[PDB]
Write a protein that binds this ligand. Structure first.
Ligand code: MG
Ligand code: MG
Ligand code: MG
Ligand code: MG
Lengths: 587, 587
């Protein structure tokens, strides 16, 4: 119900509630006043702000509480609390009274403030956040409890994924004043003409009550009116297409009227671009695209998984400079701010739900109770991002046990849910793990694009690039042979590389070996006609939990965690600026 | 003016204008539409977001521009743009019309939006920022122009200070709807009783127009009413003092009434605590205080000088954990968010204007045209921060040429300005440079506290701790003898230390030598009765410009720039947790 990005309009007052909140790790009664003994920032992960390991490793309920002054609310208006996200679970309280809940730490949700408080001077907002992950949540965790022999139970979450379980309120919290009779949702679809000069637009505006008129004004990038409609349909000539690294955005100003007066107004951006997957190719605007980019992470020093718009722009500027053109929201939906940035900069985005960890240590599909959370995640993501021209593909899961029995039955309705909910019917994919090699895999028949995470030379044939090349070329041909019409994209491939580590003997973990690894990989990729994309793992080093294979987090980044480059960055820029975005390898 | 922190009240609608703005380094006509070819985040430094050195080193005018939808503004209301800061200079435009201007990159200012646009659908806000520094600006820079012989002028700023000239809109920009007749300033003072159990509160509420009644309600930390008055004076009993690392804050809800109806409402926090400098001691609540802490910088990766509240809380939590109690806003006023955080966490703050670089690379005071900027800086800082209980001392300058002729005449009226403007009449100091030995210095007689930046063992007697110890002890005794009743605080002392550098032979730049340097320093400090504080340089590594003494920035941090500790951090925690906050070394 809150998939529309929060705006300041003539009918919508949007206030930011970010800043210092009273904080507590542990139990709390929302009817009681949380003291200011401990405080916390919104938005940010709380973890790296804790000095001790004990508090940084906390699992369970943790509270945010602050008294907010009530703004003027008219009779025909309603006041809601719009969360960008709360990680992972949340129960929201107003004056000690439960007013909303949400499960899933990477999707936005709104909560209605009771009308009986609109004339009060202040309201106390309490946020009960929860970072527990188990077999019912996305992402998947291994939950356990141990008795401290002190009388209390201590919770632990052994992650089923390769990234640190950062938690907290990671995205902006807004106090929204909006009309009771308001615009609920906007869907924008287009059919491009045969000459790509015209477009048949369709605006599906959802309301909660009914209005006499639904007016839509369309403006270009010069803020010039180019179209008007009251019947949810509009034809437009002299269109400017949204292009890769050359974006063009229109704005649809939607106005609803009752008795000839404005009830609510909203502005939704959109881009004109065509997507089609056919004949082992990914077509953008009817031209073959070669994906060049990164698997990423919402990860930065200090803030952790918290929003940092400066980081987004810095990352995307580096992406553009290297000659790259895309990235994947691994392994969870990123902030709306990032998606809007990608729209504005013309960066292709592979959108992904938090479906990572669907893998036992078998009998995975008798153990995974994630169906409910998986369906909601797909519902929320599509509803939130369906209008983004940057979003070009959906991901049902990252490295699930797609070789075990019951896998095909699990994913078929989920792939279908993507196809049913997305009005653009964009391609959906499943990110494949090495254990699910062509013969054993039983799910890749459901998707439109084959996405592979392969580490020949790092995990398999470690430090053995000679035999790694034989192995990767062998399997890529197997995939291409099993699905002759499906395009292939490498979504993950890389090697842990610590800055400063050097050698003349192609030694793993050194900067030179990272260069050698990618050079070999690309030699193989360029020989596969159906391979239409390469996305490295990762853009930058990121935090993980404690595992012997992890040398203080993950170091497969091309850049360090401070966005400083490694040796391999210079090499990628040469390759990526040589290969055009529109690149046909069928010739 | 714009001294008051932006709040959301029933009479004040405050909207955040942060996000993505259309950006351009170079010339621009605000009557024209800035395209979206380049974008930039507010708030952040723009520098580290540029991939190329050329654009990162840009000096001159650079523009932010965005079309903003106008919210509801009633007949008795006005609409202003409230900038937390713009670095360094700014001209503000609304629909191409100049409407505001400010000089100084670290203080807030507001700008009125023309009333004739309150009923317009949208307004275009253009920000013409400028990062030029010279002999008329604070901080001081060495400006120069060189023709590229292409017909164009290339500007260059050679900094007169040891930190990178980060620029941009570093702090939140607010769109504020407020009543035309509003509260524009609130001054809160208090006289503590002899038993420290009661307090006499004085309030000075300033409005731009006449009001019938000023009602002030005071609430404690439990949000309970403890007093109310219409006469701007109030007596309190059973008061709770604001203590070091044990803060207690009261809230003053100020309401102005006209014709028996609410005109405007604002809430200002304050703390009850007493400050006095006497007999070579710094007294907080009539008890001898020992300062333990850091000289800091508003500096993180990516954001540069941009506001990061998470970074503020992370740093202050580390400060608290180590047993420290204070820091200095070197070398410019920090964000209001940081000051308010320090209030909440009971951290002592030495507040500082950007008066750094008053030193010619003699005759400094025949070349410095900084008088006007210096007076404004003091006026703005005091007006903004006077109600902060965390602020315990003002700095008039950092390392000026205080040994040259003309120095005393320059600083005497500036020290006086601090005393005249500050209603609490807090001690003011001058941060002294090593060239100005007790015999040479001619300005320290004006200040209440002697603050010294000394690097015996690093700059003088480099890597010779034996001779360094003699030198620092010798001069410290001279300062104590020249000013027998002035407290001494070491505001800077440290050694560049790159993580990973190790040796058994006390080698500079290694982690061991940093420990050795500080161990020697403290042995000396503990033998000086009048030395009442130690603040290291720096808390964390930070960015500087290019010069041979700088190994990719400054590495004198106890922590790395990513807030990871160095070897010495463990040693400081031992010492700082043994020495209490209230520590009398007169005995
Ligand atoms: Mg930030
Ligand atoms: Mg491989
Ligand atoms: Mg020294
Ligand atoms: Mg001592």
């Amino acid at each position: 119900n809150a998939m529309l990005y929060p705006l300041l309009t003539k009918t919508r007052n949007t206030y930011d509630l970010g800043g210092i909140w009273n904080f507590k790790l542990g139990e709390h009664n929302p009817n009681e006043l949380l003291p200011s003994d401990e405080v916390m920032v919104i938005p940010t992960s709380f973890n790296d702000l804790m000095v001790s390991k004990e508090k940084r490793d906390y699992i369970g309920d943790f509270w945010y509480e602050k008294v907010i002054e009530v703004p003027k609310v008219s009779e025909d208006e309603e006041m809601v609390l719009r969360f960008g996200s709360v990680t992972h679970q949340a129960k929201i309280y107003v004056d000690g009274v439960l007013v909303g809940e949400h499960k899933g730490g990477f999707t936005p949700f709104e909560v209605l403030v009771p009308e009986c408080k609109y004339n009060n001077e202040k309201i106390k907002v309490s946020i009960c956040a929860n970072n527990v992950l188990d077999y019912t949540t996305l992402p998947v965790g291994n939950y356990s409890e141990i008795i401290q022999e002190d009388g209390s139970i201590k919770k632990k979450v052994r992650e089923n994924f390769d990234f640190f379980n950062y938690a907290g309120v990671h995205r902006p919290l807004k106090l929204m004043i909006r009309p009771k009779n308001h615009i609920f949702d906007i869907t924008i679809t287009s059919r491009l003409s045969d000459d790509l000069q015209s477009a048949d637009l369709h605006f599906l505006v959802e309301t909660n009550q009914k209005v006499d008129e639904v007016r839509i004004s369309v403006f270009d990038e010069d803020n010039k009116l180019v179209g008007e409609t009251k019947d949810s349909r509009l034809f437009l000539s002299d269109v400017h297409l949204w292009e890769v690294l050359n974006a063009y955005l229109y704005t649809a100003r939607v106005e609803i009227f009752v008795d000839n007066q404005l009830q609510d107004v909203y502005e939704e951006n959109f881009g004109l671009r065509e997507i089609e997957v056919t004949n082992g190719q990914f077509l953008l605007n009817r031209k073959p695209i070669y994906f060049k980019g990164f698997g990423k992470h919402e990860d930065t020093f200090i803030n952790g998984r918290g929003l940092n718009e400066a980081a987004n722009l810095m990352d995307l500027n580096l992406l553009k400079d290297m000659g790259a053109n895309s990235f994947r929201t691994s392994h969870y939906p990123y902030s709306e701010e990032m998606m809007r940035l990608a729209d504005r900069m013309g960066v292709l985005v592979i959108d992904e739900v938090p479906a990572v960890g669907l893998f036992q240590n078998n009998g995975t599909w008798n153990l995974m109770q994630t169906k409910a959370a998986h369906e909601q995640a797909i519902q929320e993501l599509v509803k939130r991002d369906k209008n983004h021209p940057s979003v070009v593909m959906w991901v049902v899961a990252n490295e699930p046990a797609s070789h075990e029995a019951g896998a095909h039955d699990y994913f078929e309705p989920l792939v279908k849910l993507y196809k049913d909910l997305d009005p653009q019917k964009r391609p959906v994919t499943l990110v494949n793990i090495l254990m699910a090699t062509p013969d054993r895999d039983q799910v890749m028949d459901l998707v439109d694009v084959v996405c592979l995470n392969r580490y020949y030379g790092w995990y398999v044939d470690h430090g053995d690039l000679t035999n790694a090349e034989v192995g990767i070329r062998k399997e890529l041909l197997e995939w291409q042979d099993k699905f002759p019409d499906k395009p292939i994209i490498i979504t993950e491939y890389g090697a842990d590389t610590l800055p400063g580590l050097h050698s003349t003997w192609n030694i793993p973990y050194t900067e030179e070996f990272q260069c050698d690894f990618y050079e070999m990989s690309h030699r193989v990729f360029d020989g596969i006609p159906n391979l239409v994309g390469e996305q490295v793992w990762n853009f930058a080093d990121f935090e993980t939990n404690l595992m012997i294979l992890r040398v203080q987090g993950n170091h497969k980044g091309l850049f360090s965690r401070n966005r400083q480059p490694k040796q391999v960055v210079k090499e990628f820029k040469k390759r990526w600026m040589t290969i055009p975005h529109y690149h046909n390898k069928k010739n």
